[PDB]
Amino acid sequence: MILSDKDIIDYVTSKRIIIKPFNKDFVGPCSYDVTLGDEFIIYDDEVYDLSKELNYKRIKIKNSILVCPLNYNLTEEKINYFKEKYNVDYVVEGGVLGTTNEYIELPNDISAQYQGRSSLGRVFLTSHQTAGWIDAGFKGKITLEIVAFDKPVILYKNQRIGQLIFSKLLSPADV
Amino acid sequence: MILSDKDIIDYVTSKRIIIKPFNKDFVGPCSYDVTLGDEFIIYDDEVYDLSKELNYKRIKIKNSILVCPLNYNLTEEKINYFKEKYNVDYVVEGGVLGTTNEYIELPNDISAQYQGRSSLGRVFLTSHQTAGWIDAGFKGKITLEIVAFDKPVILYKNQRIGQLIFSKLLSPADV
Amino acid sequence: MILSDKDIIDYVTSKRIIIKPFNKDFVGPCSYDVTLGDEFIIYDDEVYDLSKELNYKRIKIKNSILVCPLNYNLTEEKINYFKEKYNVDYVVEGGVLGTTNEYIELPNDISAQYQGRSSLGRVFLTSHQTAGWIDAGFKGKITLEIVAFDKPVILYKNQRIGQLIFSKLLSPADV
């Protein structure tokens, strides 16, 4: 059973679900809208071999970023052309990891599911790869897995990026 | 809690959930199958900059369309080769937006989730990018975000494209 | 309503949900972790035309596979370079279909949803394209639709690949 607006507000009011920072107007009929943090990481090695430690580069945007589909094949010239024309701070290609501004804690009787905003889906921008259920008892900001599938997309620091849907568990979990 | 076949039929019978057109045989154990409309739109600008108005081209298929993965790099020659060999009306590459034939209205105590058909998923054809929850109180046809991830896929006008799963809210939402 | 660890164990203990093979430690707060089978199939025709019978090639890994993003454009030389450097049995590009080791049966009052593991999502490896709800009454192993979206990813025979979330239906379905 999925929490409505009135349930989200109660659970947040009594500290059953923690959302920091919290904003009332981000509560929709049965979800809570989350926003795009300013930090991203880009993988730097040839393959992902999870028996090794991974190497990343980190960026911190001031306003905006251009996210390009895989195999756009960006040269320095192209990146510079995009930076000047669209006034973006960075131009990336392929998978980029980001994060919500919002920190969450879920209690033992709630699971949440992150989904990317539907207006971004309509321009083929995803902020999640998996269906994205999050365990009861989870604590943290949410990691975004950002990929553009059609053409490059500009994203803005602190925009609404997606939303959490909260669902009751049948019974409490052992967290 | 997810509505079963018998619940979907009741909610539709009493006009709690509107599905137009409605077909009984599209009701499965715990979902409702939806069909592919004949209209698609293709984005026409270099980047998606959502502070501007977007330019699209619209197509109306009569039978079928070939959807190609991004960076198939279609020339006129290739498009013509595909049109003749597979008898398709159009050949597209990358993201294409479509719509269900079905118009839906959800009441204040139901959220629905669109998911693409699993036989299409097995050939790497998606009709949705986000997890696709739809708010209680929603009205409209459902927008499909169609992308092929392996090789080109033929789709047919009015085929089953996906399905709606309906879930009860804990409490009514203020719609 | 989503089953917790204690519910998953009960349903499995009384044969309400069948999971073969079953392992207690794969039960998380509100999901059940599933593992990567050793068999994969790769589509062999130019387009997916679902009015025809499909041609596939089958592989059986002994340890590991390298999954490359679409349009990595693998030559024999590149495949050999990867096989030797990363000690993988096979190198594939684009969509590859696999399967869980686990065979499941769901009763008439449960629907399950497969989602890929979140650590794999963070390296842009998906094992499902659709949201992946599975009907009440389903019987079988789960088909994985594996695509890498950023750089090539090594997967291991029998690793945790994803997880099932089980949700109660409002009423029983006619299976």
Structural overview:
The first copy, chain A, is mainly β. The first copy, chain A, has one domain: Deoxyuridine triphosphatase (dUTPase) (Deoxyuridine 5'-Triphosphate Nucleotidohydrolase, Chain A), CATH 2.70.40. The first copy, chain A, has three helices and 14 strands. In chain A, the strands form four sheets. Chain A has a five-stranded antiparallel beta sheet. A four-stranded antiparallel beta sheet of chain A has the order 1-8-12-10, with no helix packed on it. In chain A, strands 7-6-13 form a three-stranded mixed beta sheet, covered by helices on one side. In chain A, strand 6 (64-68), helix 2 and strand 7 (90-93) form a beta-alpha-beta unit. The longest helix of chain A has 11 residues, at 76-86. Chain A starts with a helix and ends in a 7-residue tail after the last strand. The relative contact order of chain A is 0.24.
